[PDB]
Every structure is written in structure tokens, then in C-alpha cells.
Ligand binder design. Structure first.
Ligand SMILES: [Mg+2]
Ligand SMILES: [Mg+2]
Ligand SMILES: [Mg+2]
Ligand SMILES: [Mg+2]
Ligand SMILES: [Mg+2]
Ligand SMILES: [Mg+2]
Ligand SMILES: [Mg+2]
Ligand SMILES: [Mg+2]
Ligand SMILES: [Mg+2]
Ligand SMILES: [Mg+2]
Ligand SMILES: [Mg+2]
Ligand SMILES: [Mg+2]
Ligand SMILES: [Mg+2]
Ligand SMILES: [Mg+2]
Ligand SMILES: [Mg+2]
Ligand SMILES: [Mg+2]
Ligand SMILES: [Mg+2]
Ligand SMILES: [Mg+2]
Ligand SMILES: [Mg+2]
Ligand SMILES: [Mg+2]
Lengths: 132, 195, 86, 144, 149, 65
RNA sequence: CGUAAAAGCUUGCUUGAUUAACGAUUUCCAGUACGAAUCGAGACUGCGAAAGCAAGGCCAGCGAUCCUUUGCGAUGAACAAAUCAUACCAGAGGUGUCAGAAUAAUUACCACAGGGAUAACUGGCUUGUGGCGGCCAAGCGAUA
RNA sequence: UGCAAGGCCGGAAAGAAAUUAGAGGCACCAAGUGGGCCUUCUUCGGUAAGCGGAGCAGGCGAUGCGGAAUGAACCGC
RNA sequence: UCGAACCACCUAGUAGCUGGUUCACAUCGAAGUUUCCCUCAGGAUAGCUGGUGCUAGUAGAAGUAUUGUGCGGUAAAGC
RNA sequence: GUACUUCUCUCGUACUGAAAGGGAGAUGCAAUGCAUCUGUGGUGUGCACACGUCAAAUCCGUUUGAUUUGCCCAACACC
RNA sequence: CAGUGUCAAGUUGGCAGGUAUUUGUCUGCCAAAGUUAAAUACAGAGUAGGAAGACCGAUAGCGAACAAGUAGCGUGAGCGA
């Protein structure tokens, strides 16, 4: 019988089994080792194509939002118009020399942009940009 | 020959189901000692080895300290420090900052429990190294370590029976506290009943 | 059964609780308005079989001191009057 | 492992352990958790006492981030000061400076007597916690 | 199974005995009970307020509780494969102070007081004599037996 | 079909276990309060005494050893 | 069953037929509800000079989840306010199939799964019915 | 004050209720079973039954062997 | 093929119902009962039973007697 | 496949309340203060204690004190 | 979201801020136009090329190891060795 078992709640009542009648709706990761090799092969092959450029662009520090994460820093996409203006670079010209640009961030605390404005002029120091 | 004596047979666990090759050495060590000695210790420390892994509950250094302080308060005050033997394994205790220089003999130690002993001033032993010091186990304080409060033992029960403060098997902790566990849902599991 | 209009209390006006307003916008009826809406059957059961003919009497001992209505509940009586002991 | 099975162990038993009178059927005691109030009510009322009801008010959009308050006790503070970081807690008379949220542990609960004097910086702190630390050579500091 | 009320099949059980009816004793009101003594839970009628269930009538057991006018008695009840120590709550009149130990209350009272008298005491007064042995018995009336019809 | 047959012999296989003695579950609880509220306060004192009696012991057993 | 200076009768004064912090228990029992009881505690009380008695009329007379509903005095989650809703709490509306689906037929045109767990059938069994017989005949006619 | 009472307690106590003393106590997990039948004793219903419903114990089921020629149940075992 | 055709599909539809379910030996070994169920061809829950045990256990042992000590209203009896 | 991995998450070390929320060391003085280690009693391995006991000899079976480990029962405190 | 009825406003704004309503504030955002790689799904055209396997081993593995969707069946949809 039953008895002193946890009420199951298994949630497998929607034809997920790829039987003879149903096409099945399961995602088995039998290809993730092929894909890890697949991506690192594109990655290492895209890197020698973009060379001498860095494969990854430059991303700023941003604060993870909620009270659970607000003390954890993170790399967000693009900087802002603000850091770029407070570091000289035109956000049209920053977005073409590897710097990633985000016209949506709002620089709510000066604290925030100060870490990133200075983070630009580190890059803008150790970047050659040899002309064409 | 009518008997009735059919169910009086107790399950004693003759051997160990462990496959650890370093405990089958301690077991052959403590069959020799437990058999060809008049030691009460060696008898007892042998059934505790062949015993299973869920039944050899770990004692924290806290438990070892306090009970070795309850021994060392009534001694000759210069006689000796008995050896705290536990046939489970010893775990560190971050609630005990200062630990005495006590000798301990466990099948295992945490990496933080071995350093806490050796930093304290004591030396943690083994059982091939305690068969050299009191093999009969004179001056050894044998210990189990609490196996109640274990989450397995507090699901044991029904939890819907009056006077059953057991925990229902429920992943969702906020699933079953409704009807049957409320005084205003036509009955409340009676928290007390004489048994 | 009879019952007195007045009961003295040391701790008083009797009304014989007869509520039943049956609000709209009650959470179980908003659901119902949503749940039995449109197609499908009468998407809920309904007490069809007969009933307990006699009904239990809630009795609201509203203190003549302003506030804090009490409720006592009597037994199941067919005829209930507050005649108050003629 | 399929050889480690009992219907592979009990070949030739003709029933694989399900009997001759009550034959092993398909779903025969309902299917699923069916009958929790009808015919398995004795199982549910007795191993699942609180199932089958309603309780409390609804919190519609529940977000576990704003309702996030992990807790550490006073006897577990030593879990955040390495012996080296506590080696400076020996010399110079410099109390340890513990900062909870960096290790998790928003709230600081007061359990036991604090082994080592320190100054914790926690978002939240209990009344008895706020008092054991400030009377053990220490100080709670509220952050965020 | 038409009727199984709290007082079923109990005509002769709660019925008072012949020519002894009416109010309970003044002894039964002047009894003295502690937590621990034994009591015969002999439910009498004519009080009809506090009688236990039928089952607990020939039953005796510890008093675990003495309220102002209700004695609480534990009673062993062999339910099916185990006995429950039931905890009944009755009034005092449904209760006797159970003799069931005078068998050795009064035994060891004089048995020790003479074992002491036999071990140390002051002196050893001779006690009850032997019971079963032989003997050259002298008869006092002969007889025979054949029939009586 | 009520039978009661085989039941008395089922109750005596694993035996009709005897009752627990009085020192088991002797919770003087749910009983008459003015007793247990006094058998409570006298337990508190008798515990302050049990703790105190061990305090001299160890301290007598120290100096007198 | 029980009761006789009452538990019945008459009168008096009354609401203890109330809140009960509900604590425990009994019966049903799985020692789970429920229902009804028992022993209590805290008030506040009534009746008594008092001890005491009373938390109905003993013991049958009753009802879960959800919903509705009233009483009773935290939330609606960017903040604030009032409504509105919900929540906790205690009750009521009720499930008589009374541990609680929301319910009419007919099938000989019928179909299926099975069942000798169960009828017609058949094998028995039942020995009283229905029909046959014995001794004894008030006497019939003591018997053709 | 001290009796008595509870929670205690130390000083002290031994037996001049038979037997087995075929070890007590819990705990966990899990089946199968939830159609029984016969029988002894007694006994409710029925004209009766190789009948229906019970109480007790024993059986059969789930079990042979031995013999009542023969028999799930009887007698031995 | 018709009281709803035929083909393919949903579909391996569901079945508390019927049939079957593949080696050996060893160690033990039952139940047809309790309560609840639109329940009475089924379940759930106890009991029975197995395995693993834990534990200081001639004891908190007993289908037994003795001893005291209660209880009862059937047989017989008596109208 | 193997090897490495900060980061994070996950389970849990803390529970509770419907919710706002809150949130468990012990002892002495107190009704918060100060030194700041089993929490109480009970049932309780092992060893050390002395205690004698046909005891080959003297090591162990007997046992009584000590601490009692686990466990259980009772009732403290605290959330 | 749809359908019908209704049908706006204008940055003194509009929508979103998971409980309805009104009154306020605050925060984000700017619908009713449009394009946009990659990471993601798929072995179907194996198209092109393949590589593998604790798989099956001819009653198995695809229905099909072979002149297999063939012979043969069905009025036909289809069935199918
Ligand atoms: Mg614990
Ligand atoms: Mg079955
Ligand atoms: Mg069956
Ligand atoms: Mg801040
Ligand atoms: Mg009266
Ligand atoms: Mg009942
Ligand atoms: Mg009740
Ligand atoms: Mg009544
Ligand atoms: Mg009265
Ligand atoms: Mg036989
Ligand atoms: Mg014959
Ligand atoms: Mg007679
Ligand atoms: Mg002790
Ligand atoms: Mg529209
Ligand atoms: Mg608008
Ligand atoms: Mg808005
Ligand atoms: Mg508005
Ligand atoms: Mg405005
Ligand atoms: Mg657009
Ligand atoms: Mg072939």
C-alpha cells in the first residue's frame, strides 16, 4: 500500500515520453560534450580571426540589483553615455574600438560611474589602435 | 516438539557490510582482542565497528570536551587524561573555541577536527595506535555521539496521531499546515496524549 | 422554544442573528463569476437532496454598553420566539 | 543494475511477489493521489494531517529576493574569522571586523555566548544578539 | 450494531444490589486517596454523574490524579496486541481503596517484625507450625460404605 | 461477515505486550493544576539544590584532594 | 438503570443553558475525527445560613475541506490615505447516502468485461408440504 | 511549631507467589492477506438441512505421514 | 461489416475484471479480521508476517498456577 | 573520456507566525546585572574505585562508589 | 486575445509598478510602424561529407541485410509480407 510517503507531485502527465504514438517532448543533453568542443572551436577560431583584437569587448562593473545580490558586483553590457562623456570618448566612437556601449544605463550613483569612468582610461591607456 | 520459540531470535549483525579495507583490519584486530582477552572494552568496541555507518553517529569535539571535563573534574587531578574513544568519527565544533589537550581515538576526523585537536595540545590517535596504548582499554572513555535529533529519526512516527511531534514527509513546508493541523479546521492534531 | 427579550449580564439586547447578505465581490463568488462563466456545464455542484429541516440559532447578545457584540448559539429548535416569559 | 532486482531474483516464482488471490493489477486504488478524502482518507489524515485545506492570505507576486534574510548565530561567528585574521585579533588589540552579507547571512541571531569578541556588521540583529555582543567586548553595526 | 451507546448492555451491571439502594456511604465520602494508591473502580449507580464506561468496573489501578471531587485512575486495558494504560476520570464514590495489597501489607508488617525478631529483634516467639506430614493416627469411629438405596 | 475467529490467537503471537510501568510517561500533566503548580515550584528549588550540591563537591574535591 | 426528610411534588429566588486560556480523559477507535459524556482550571455568577450545588434538562437528538455569512479588535508587497477585499479568531448556513459526487428511465436490437462470489437451469440436499401407510378405536360399522 | 502532603533524600531492608526462569524493551522499512471453510463446546434464526448468523478453542486453507476399506477437516502424529 | 459503415489516426484508449509472469537451495512465514470508503469482485488503516536493527537487559517476562483481593447475575434454583 | 575552475546556486547549520514580523548558552546576585561549559532528575555501556567473594594463582567473573557516552522517561529554561 | 458597444490623452501627458476604487506622490518606460546576425530547435531534403557505439545479429535490428513499400490484399482511403 501507501503509507508515510511524501505526496509525490511528479508532474509527468503531459505526453513527454516519445512513444510510438507521441513525438515526445524531452531534451536530452547527449551533445553537450560535442557542443563544448564546438563552441571552444569557434571561439578559438573566431579569436584568431578578430586578432589582434580582444575576443571579448570591455564591460563595466555593475551592481547586481536585489537586496540578495546588491553587494555582488557584475559585468553589465555597455557603459553609459555618462562614463564615455566623463572620459572623452564619443559613444559612437567608443562602440567601434572595443568599448561596449549602453544607452540605457542611468548612472544613478556617482559612486557607480567613478569605478567605470576610471575603468575606461585603463583600457584607453593600454590600447594601441594602429590606423589603416 | 512444540516450541513457540520462533521469534525470540535477535538480529545481531554478525559481520560488517563495509568494504573499507582499513576497517577490516581494525575488525580482525578487534576480533583477536575482543575474543582472546578478558576486556570489557574490546567486546564493546568490536560490535561498534561491525555496526553500520548510520549507527556510528559522529560526536563533535564539543561533546568530547564537555564529557571529558565531567570526567577530569573527579580524578586524582594528576592521575592521567583518559582517551576519548569514539567508534564513529570526530567532527569539529565552531561553538567550542578553546579545546583541552585531550587524546582522542576515532575511525576518522574532520580535517578541521584533526587540526583543532593538534592545535589544542592533544594528539588524535588511531585504533592500530590504541592497540599499543591500553589494548584492553584501561583509562579509555568510550563514546557514541548523539543519533537523536537526526532528521531521519524525527520523521519516524505518523505526525497526524495525537501526541506525535514528528515531521511529515513534505518538500513544500507550507503545504501541510492546513486542516488537521489547525484548531479551527474541524480538528487539530492533539499535541499531547498520555501513552 | 421561547427566549427572553432581556438577559441580565454581569461580565443584553437580543436580535436573533439572521444574516445572509451574500455580497458580490466576495473572493469565492468572484472566482465563481469567473469559474462558471460561459461554456461548460453548471461548473459547480449544488445541494439538491433534502435538508435538516430544523435550523440552529445563533443569538447575538449585543451589550447595551455600546460595542463588542457577543454571539451565543442555541440548539436546533423549530419555532423560536423572543416572547420573554409572559 | 538489473541482476540486483527481485523480479530477476525471483524468476520462476510466477507472481514476482504480488500474490495469487489479490493479483497485481494496474491502478486499482485510484490513480495518483486520488481518494484523499474518500478512500485513502485514513492515510492522509494520519500521515499528512495538514493536507486538504486553505490557510493564510495570498501573496500574489512573491519574490524571494526582497524576502531574503539568512541568519547566523553568535556561537557561529568564528566561522568567518580565519586563524590569521584572528592572529591579528590577538596582537594590537584590534577586534575582528566581520562583515556578514559578504558571506551571506543578512541577519545576526544571538544564540549561545559569543566565543571570540568581535564587531559584526549585519543588516539585521536580534535584541539579545545586539546585547550579547555589546557586552562581550564587541559591537554590532547595521548596514544597508 | 443498532445501539452501542455509552451505557449499552448494562442493565444488571449498574443496577444496585438487592435491598441496598440509595445514597452512597459516608465512608466512601470520608475515604482518603493519594496519587499512587490502588482503587477498585466499582461504578455504583444512584450517583449517575461520573460513572465510568462499563469496561472499567471490575478494574483496579493506580490513582494518578486526585482532583477536588474526581479521582483519576489509570487502568490497564488489553486493547488488541498491547495494553493501554487508560486514564479514567471518575468521582470518588465510584472508588474503593483497594485491599489488593493487604496480602503483603499485613504480611511483611508482622513477617519482618518477626524476621527481625528472628534475625535480631529481642526474642523469637514460636510461630505457626507445620502442616503436611505423616502420623500414626488413632481412629475414633469405624465405618464402611456399600449403598443407600 | 464478522467472525472474531483467529483473532485471540493473532493477539497472542507477538504477545499481548504488558503495560508500561509507572515510571514510563508519568507526565502529571492535564491533571489538577494546584498540585502540579506546586510540584513545579518544588522542582525548581530542588534543581537549584541539585546544581548547588555539585558546586561544593567539585570545590571540596579540589582542595581536599 | 436510578431516586422517598428526593433526583419526584409545591413554592421561592434565578440564568451556570454564560465566558470557559481549554487542560486531561471516556466511550467509537486506527487508540483518527466527529457526537455525546467525565475530571478539572480561570473568571464572572446565581441559588443557599452553611457545607456545598450549577459551566443545561444524565445517558439518542447530529456534520469535514471549500464557499457563503456574522462576530472578533495584520496584509493588499513603489510609497500614503480612506473604502473595498483578504487574513487570523469563534460561531452559523450542510452535506440523512448522516467521515460529507451535484442526478431519471428503458433495451426482446442490445454490446462488453467477467461471475457458479450470484438467480433461471442442472446435479444433489432439505421429509415438512402434497399425496401413502401402523398399532389403539368414544364408538362408527371395537374394525367386512 | 509539628502532623499529614507533594518533589526529594540518605541512614539503613529482607525475603527459611510455584514454574518456565527457553532474554526485556522499544524502533524502522515492506510485503501478502482483508471471499475462508470445517470442527468441538452453546446457540440465535429456520419445517428442516451437507441451512443461515454468532461465541470459544482447534484445525484445514498452507500438510504430508500413519489408519477409520474410501474422504481437505475425523483418530494418531 | 450497419440499433451508427469502412480506412488511418489519437491509441500501447481504460479495465477494482479474466488469463499469463522464465533458476536453485537456504532461512523464516501468514491472512480472510478491525475501522473508513457511492464502500461490499477494490482500496486505505491496524492485526498477522519478513528484513534491518538499536539497546544496560533473567525482566517493563508469561494464553500457567498459588496467595490474597476485587468484579459479575449466565447455569441451576426459586416464583 | 580524463584533468582544472574561480563564480554562483543548492541543500542546512534555526525555528516560528495567517501576517506585519520576530528569533533559542548555562550558573550564581537580582527581579537587569556580573564571572560566563553537560541543564535537571531518573534508567543507563565502557573504565577507575575499593569490595569481598570455592577461586590454579592471583589475573579475572561478583559488586558497591565516581563520571556516566548513547537512549529513553519526567519537567526547567529559552525562541 | 477576440468579437460587439464605447472610445481617449497629449510630455499640466500616456502606460507599467501582480487586490478592486478614488485622492496623491514616487520609480521605470514611451504602445498603437519596420528591419536585425549569433547563441537555440531539427537528421526531415543524408543534400554534401562523415565519424562513432557496453546497440540488434536474420522470428532480432527499419515494414524492408535479398529485384521491399516490392509480391500479394482492398472498389477505394489503405494494408503489407
Ligand atoms: Mg538537533
Ligand atoms: Mg491487493
Ligand atoms: Mg479477494
Ligand atoms: Mg546603502
Ligand atoms: Mg443535582
Ligand atoms: Mg461514537
Ligand atoms: Mg468534542
Ligand atoms: Mg444530549
Ligand atoms: Mg444538576
Ligand atoms: Mg493432519
Ligand atoms: Mg468405513
Ligand atoms: Mg433457568
Ligand atoms: Mg547519575
Ligand atoms: Mg477588442
Ligand atoms: Mg487614457
Ligand atoms: Mg498607475
Ligand atoms: Mg486615481
Ligand atoms: Mg494629479
Ligand atoms: Mg519598435
Ligand atoms: Mg528465418
Amino acid at each position: 500500500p501507501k503509507g508515510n510517503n511524501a505526496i509525490p507531485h511528479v508532474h509527468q502527465k503531459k505526453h513527454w515520453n516519445p512513444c510510438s504514438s507521441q513525438k515526445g517532448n524531452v531534451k536530452v543533453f547527449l551533445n553537450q560534450p560535442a557542443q563544448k568542443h564546438r563552441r571552444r572551436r569557434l571561439r578559438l577560431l573566431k579569436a584568431k580571426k578578430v586578432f589582434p583584437r580582444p575576443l571579448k569587448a570591455l564591460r563595466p562593473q555593475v551592481n547586481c540589483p536585489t537586496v540578495r545580490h546588491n553587494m555582488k558586483r557584475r559585468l553589465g553590457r555597455g557603459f553609459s553615455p555618462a562614463e564615455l562623456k566623463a572620459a572623452g570618448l564619443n559613444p559612437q566612437y567608443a562602440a567601434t574600438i572595443g568599448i561596449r556601449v549602453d544607452s540605457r544605463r542611468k548612472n544613478k550613483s556617482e559612486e557607480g560611474m567613478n569605478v567605470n569612468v576610471q575603468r575606461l582610461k585603463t583600457y584607453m591607456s593600454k590600447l594601441v589602435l594602429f590606423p589603416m | 516438539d512444540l516450541t513457540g520459540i520462533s521469534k525470540k531470535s535477535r538480529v545481531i549483525r554478525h559481520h560488517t557490510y563495509s568494504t573499507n579495507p582499513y576497517i577490516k583490519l581494525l575488525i580482525k584486530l578487534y576480533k583477536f582482542l575482543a575474543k582472546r582477552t578478558s576486556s570489557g572494552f574490546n567486546k564493546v568496541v568490536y560490535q561498534r565497528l561491525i555496526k553500520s555507518r548510520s549507527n556510528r553517529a559522529p560526536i563533535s569535539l564539543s561533546r568530547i570536551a564537555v564529557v571529558m571535563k565531567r570526567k577530569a573534574v573527579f580524578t586524582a587531578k594528576s592521575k592521567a587524561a583518559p582517551i576519548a574513544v569514539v567508534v564513529g568519527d570526530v567532527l569539529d565544533d565552531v561553538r567550542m573555541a578553546r579545546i583541552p589537550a585531550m587524546r582522542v581515538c576515532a575511525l576518522r576526523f574532520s580535517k578541521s577536527a584533526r587540526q583543532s585537536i593538534v592545535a589544542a595540545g592533544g594528539e588524535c590517535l588511531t585504533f592500530d595506535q590504541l592497540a599499543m596504548i591500553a589494548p584492553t582499554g584501561k583509562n579509555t572513555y568510550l563514546l557514541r555521539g548523539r543519533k537523536s535529533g537526526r532528521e531521519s529519526v524525527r520523521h519516524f512516527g505518523a505526525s497526524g496521531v495525537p501526541g506525535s511531534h514528528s515531521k511529515p514527509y513534505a518538500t513544500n513546508r507550507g503545504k501541510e499546515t492546513k486542516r488537521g493541523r489547525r484548531t479551527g479546521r474541524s480538528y487539530k492534531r492533539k499535541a499531547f496524549r498520555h501513552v | 422554544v421561547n427566549y427572553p427579550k432581556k438577559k441580565v449580564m454581569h461580565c443584553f439586547k437580543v436580535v436573533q442573528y439572521k444574516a445572509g447578505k451574500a455580497r458580490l465581490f466576495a473572493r469565492g463568488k468572484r472566482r465563481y463569476d469567473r469559474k462558471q462563466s460561459g461554456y461548460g456545464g453548471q461548473t459547480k455542484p449544488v445541494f439538491h437532496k433534502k435538508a435538516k429541516t430544523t435550523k440552529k440559532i445563533v443569538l447575538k447578545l449585543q451589550c447595551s454598553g455600546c460595542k463588542s457584540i457577543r454571539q451565543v448559539v442555541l440548539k436546533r429548535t423549530k419555532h423560536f420566539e423572543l416572547n420573554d416569559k409572559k | 543494475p538489473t541482476r540486483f532486482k527481485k523480479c530477476r531474483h525471483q524468476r520462476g516464482s510466477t507472481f514476482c511477489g504480488y500474490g495469487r488471490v489479490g493479483k497485481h493489477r494496474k491502478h486499482e486504488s485510484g490513480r495518483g493521489n486520488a481518494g484523499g478524502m474518500h478512500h485513502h482518507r485514513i492515510n492522509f489524515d494520519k500521515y499528512h494531517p495538514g493536507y486538504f485545506g486553505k490557510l493564510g492570505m495570498d501573496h500574489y507576486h512573491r519574490k524571494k529576493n526582497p524576502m531574503w534574510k539568512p541568519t547566523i548565530n553568535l556561537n557561529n561567528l568564528s566561522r568567518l574569522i580565519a586563524a590569521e585574521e584572528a592572529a591579528k585579533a590577538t596582537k594590537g588589540g584590534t577586534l575582528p571586523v566581520v562583515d556578514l552579507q559578504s558571506s551571506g547571512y543578512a541577519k545576526l541571531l544571538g544564540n549561545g555566548h559569543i566565543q571570540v569578541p568581535c564587531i559584526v556588521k549585519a543588516r539585521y540583529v536580534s535584541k539579545l544578539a545586539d546585547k550579547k555582543i555589546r557586552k562581550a567586548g564587541g559591537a554590532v553595526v547595521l548596514q544597508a | 450494531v443498532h445501539s452501542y451507546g455509552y451505557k449499552s448492555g448494562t442493565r444488571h451491571l449498574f443496577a444496585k444490589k438487592f435491598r441496598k439502594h440509595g445514597a452512597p456511604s459516608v465512608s466512601t465520602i470520608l475515604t482518603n486517596i493519594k496519587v499512587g494508591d490502588y482503587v477498585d473502580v466499582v461504578a455504583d449507580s444512584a450517583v449517575r454523574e461520573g460513572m465510568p464506561h462499563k469496561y472499567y468496573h471490575g478494574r483496579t489501578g493506580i490513582v494518578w490524579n486526585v482532583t477536588p471531587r474526581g479521582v483519576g485512575v489509570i487502568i490497564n486495558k488489553p486493547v488488541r496486541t498491547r495494553t493501554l494504560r487508560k486514564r479514567i476520570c471518575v468521582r470518588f464514590e465510584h472508588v474503593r481503596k483497594s485491599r489488593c495489597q493487604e496480602a503483603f501489607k499485613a504480611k511483611e508488617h508482622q513477617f519482618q517484625a518477626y524476621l527481625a525478631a528472628k534475625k535480631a529483634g529481642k526474642a523469637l516467639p514460636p510461630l505457626k507450625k507445620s502442616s503436611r506430614m505423616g502420623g500414626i493416627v488413632r481412629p475414633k469411629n469405624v465405618e464402611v460404605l456399600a449403598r443407600r438405596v | 461477515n464478522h467472525t472474531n475467529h483467529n483473532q485471540s490467537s493473532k493477539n497472542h503471537r507477538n504477545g499481548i505486550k504488558g503495560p508500561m510501568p509507572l515510571h514510563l510517561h508519568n507526565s502529571k500533566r492535564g491533571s489538577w493544576l494546584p498540585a502540579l503548580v506546586n510540584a513545579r515550584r518544588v522542582r525548581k528549588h530542588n534543581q537549584k539544590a541539585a546544581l548547588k550540591k555539585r558546586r561544593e563537591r567539585i570545590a571540596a574535591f579540589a582542595a581536599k584532594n
